[PDB]
Amino acid sequence: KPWWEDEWEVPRETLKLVERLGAGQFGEVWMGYYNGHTKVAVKSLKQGSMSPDAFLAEANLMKQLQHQRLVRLYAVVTQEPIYIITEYMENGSLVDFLKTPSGIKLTINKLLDMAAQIAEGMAFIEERNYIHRDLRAANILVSDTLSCKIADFGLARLIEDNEYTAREGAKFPIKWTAPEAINYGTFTIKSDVWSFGILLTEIVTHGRIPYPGMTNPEVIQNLERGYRMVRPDNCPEELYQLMRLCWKERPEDRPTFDYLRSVLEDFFTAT
Ligand SMILES: Cc1cccc(C)c1Nc1ncc(-c2ccccc2)n2cncc12
């Protein structure tokens, strides 16, 4: 659908980049304002660093995935430097927010709350037939009202039938990704469940890097023995047994996202 017809295309004028939130290889992210008043986040592609068609595939997938628990596509600018504009999240990434004064004061109740918002957001992704493939505290975003939404959809995909198989030479963060995804390059909403498992460990330990004293090969060798992550310090035994269904050996034994939500709501209100 062409750009002079795209309901998503905006004149670049309408925008005003104020504070750079970050920079890397692929460009920059900025808070700014749309037509003066509405706070937004703007991702800009560093020319030449990656393909504009691949930059925008994120935007195009988000056009299809709209739900309160998901960070919302506002608009795109599809020339000079290419912009992706979204809804603004005031409190930045979950993984950082959990380390701040405010984050550090959160009760376990509040945390189990947030965890259920994330599972909700994924129960949508689940049911629309998408997979995320990058689910971790760094790719959860926090609002001014301490709610949570799924972010970063770089790797997110619609599936015809259950399997998405990566290209043989692909690497993903070992500590967060499911054995079959690391090994066979096969991803399903069940892989994402496994990661969610790992993210639970990030919520409940605030910041921390999962599998505390272990290198990647040590972490692989342990899984293969039938071990899983050592009960994080101060992790209610319940939520741990939950991470444990998230880490079942066979994916089809791994639970749904709707069910995780369901359970996380009980844990939450039971406290
Ligand atoms: C702008 C954008 C483009 C594509 C995909 C997404 C998820 C976003 N949104 C954001 N992406 C990134 C950030 C962000 C980046 C660094 C630090 C904190 C926030 N952000 C903050 N509020 C909204 C965002």
Side-chain angles (χ1 to χ4, degrees), residues 1-159 161-271:
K1 168 69 93 46
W3 74 261
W4 65 76
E5 270 165 0
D6 216 2
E7 41 278 313
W8 261 300
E9 189 82 30
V10 294
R12 191 194 302 286
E13 298 71 80
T14 62
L15 309 158
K16 190 208 181 357
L17 279 41
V18 176
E19 194 183 326
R20 221 230 287 107
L21 300 181
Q25 232 198 104
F26 302 100
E28 308 207 287
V29 186
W30 291 69
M31 181 277 283
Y33 293 103
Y34 171 85
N35 297 164
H37 292 287
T38 309
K39 243 190 199 211
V40 295
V42 174
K43 198 158 86 192
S44 40
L45 169 55
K46 170 164 226 195
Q47 274 86 135
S49 85
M50 106 168 64
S51 176
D53 186 83
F55 187 61
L56 290 166
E58 224 199 333
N60 283 154
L61 161 138
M62 299 171 63
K63 273 173 199 169
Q64 304 308 139
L65 277 175
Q66 286 182 242
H67 181 287
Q68 299 285 324
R69 280 316 110 217
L70 274 51
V71 172
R72 181 57 59 79
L73 186 62
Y74 286 15
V76 284
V77 173
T78 51
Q79 87 203 135
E80 7 180 55
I82 308 198
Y83 288 171
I84 308 170
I85 301 98
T86 74
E87 98 169 272
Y88 190 65
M89 322 286 306
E90 186 91 20
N91 265 151
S93 63
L94 188 47
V95 69
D96 296 323
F97 169 74
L98 283 185
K99 291 173 195 163
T100 65
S102 302
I104 286 194
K105 277 145 216 169
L106 303 181
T107 56
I108 184 55
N109 176 260
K110 181 48 198 179
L111 298 181
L112 297 165
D113 180 354
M114 276 163 164
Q117 298 177 219
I118 300 154
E120 182 168 337
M122 294 289 315
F124 173 79
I125 289 159
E126 187 169 62
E127 89 134 272
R128 302 304 307 151
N129 274 178
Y130 292 67
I131 55 195
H132 195 277
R133 294 203 306 142
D134 211 342
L135 178 85
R136 51 190 300 162
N139 297 147
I140 306 315
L141 251 36
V142 195
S143 65
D144 69 296
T145 54
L146 310 175
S147 52
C148 288
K149 318 189 173 195
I150 319 297
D152 193 317
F153 300 100
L155 302 174
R157 300 292 205 260
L158 165 70
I159 61 228
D161 350 53
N162 273 266
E163 214 84 321
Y164 177 119
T165 294
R167 286 170 158 280
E168 194 140 31
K171 341 216 98 209
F172 323 79
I174 294 273
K175 271 152 181 257
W176 272 264
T177 309
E180 74 271 355
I182 291 156
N183 286 151
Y184 309 133
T186 46
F187 288 81
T188 81
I189 195 57
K190 289 322 178 171
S191 302
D192 276 357
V193 165
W194 178 290
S195 321
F196 180 87
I198 303 286
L199 192 170
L200 291 188
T201 260
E202 301 173 283
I203 283 153
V204 99
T205 62
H206 296 83
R208 315 289 177 357
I209 290 127
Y211 296 112
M214 319 180 22
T215 60
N216 298 190
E218 295 178 302
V219 180
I220 302 175
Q221 282 152 192
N222 282 242
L223 299 177
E224 262 161 30
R225 295 189 77 182
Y227 296 177
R228 315 259 113 127
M229 193 181 296
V230 186
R231 301 192 225 251
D233 288 340
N234 301 317
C235 179
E237 176 64 22
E238 280 161 287
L239 178 70
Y240 185 66
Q241 281 310 316
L242 201 60
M243 313 166 168
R244 280 207 164 262
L245 330 167
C246 286
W247 308 312
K248 299 267 200 208
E249 171 75 11
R250 309 186 319 154
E252 75 273 13
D253 287 341
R254 289 175 220 160
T256 63
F257 273 114
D258 169 60
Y259 162 88
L260 295 162
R261 189 202 33 90
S262 157
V263 171
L264 280 154
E265 277 153 42
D266 287 335
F267 291 181
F268 153 61
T269 80
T271 70

